[PDB]
């Protein structure tokens, strides 16, 4: 005699994804430009959440609140050229400019920080 059987192997893995999907029917697509066409052609529409409502009957917890402090800085309403570094009123621009350089005050007008 001589007879027998064998062969036990597997391999039926399924791999497939879809970008967009139709609610009405089960027809999915990859590009929106393709789906839309169907949504109108046939009439169906997307499934993704829909925001066709604004009235929120759901009460919300206490409202929001924040402190609105207030303060001013180095304000000076003058009418004459005056260096903020040293503090010497002038008559003409040059006097001021030629000074900012001759003294290099415009280069050093600040430094560290407090808060
Ligand atoms: Zn459809
Ligand atoms: Zn100066």
From Swiss-Prot:
Which stretches of sequence are listed as region Disordered?
44-63
| Subcellular compartments | Nucleus; Cell projection, Growth cone
Zn finger limits (C2H2-type)? 20-44, 81-105
Instruction: Mark out the compositionally biased spans (Basic and acidic residues).
Output: 44-53
| Tissues showing expression | Expressed in brain; strongly reduced in post-mortem elderly subjects with Alzheimer disease. Expressed in the fetal neocortex.
UniProt disease link: TSHZ3 haploinsufficiency due to proximal chromosome 19q13.11 deletions causes a neurodevelopmental disorder characterized by developmental delay, absent or delayed speech, intellectual disability, and autistic features. Some patients may have reanal tract abnormalities.
Q: What does this protein do?
A: Transcriptional regulator involved in developmental processes. Functions in association with APBB1, SET and HDAC factors as a transcriptional repressor, that inhibits the expression of CASP4. TSHZ3-mediated transcription repression involves the recruitment of histone deacetylases HDAC1 and HDAC2. Associates with chromatin in a region surrounding the CASP4 transcriptional start site(s). Regulates the development of neurons involved in both respiratory rhythm and airflow control.
Subunit structure comment from the entry: Interacts (via homeobox domain) with APBB1 (via PID domain 1). Interacts (via N-terminus) with HDAC1 and HDAC2; the interaction is direct. Found in a trimeric complex with APBB1 and HDAC1; the interaction between HDAC1 and APBB1 is mediated by TSHZ3.
Provide the family line.
Belongs to the teashirt C2H2-type zinc-finger protein family.
Its name, as the record gives it, is Teashirt homolog 3
Q: Which organism is it from?
A: Homo sapiens
């Amino acid at each position: 005699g001589s007879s027998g059987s064998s062969g036990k192997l597997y391999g039926s893995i399924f791999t497939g994804a879809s970008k967009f999907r139709c609610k009405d029917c089960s027809a999915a697509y990859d590009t929106l430009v393709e789906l839309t066409v169907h949504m109108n052609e046939t009439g169906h529409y997307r499934d993704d959440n829909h925001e066709t409502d604004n009235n929120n009957p759901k009460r919300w917890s206490k409202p929001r609140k924040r402190s609105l402090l207030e303060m001013e800085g180095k304000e000076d309403a003058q009418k004459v050229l005056k260096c903020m570094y040293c503090g010497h009123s002038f008559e003409s621009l040059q006097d001021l400019s030629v000074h900012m350089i001759k003294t290099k005050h415009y280069q050093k007008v600040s430094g560290p920080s407090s808060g």
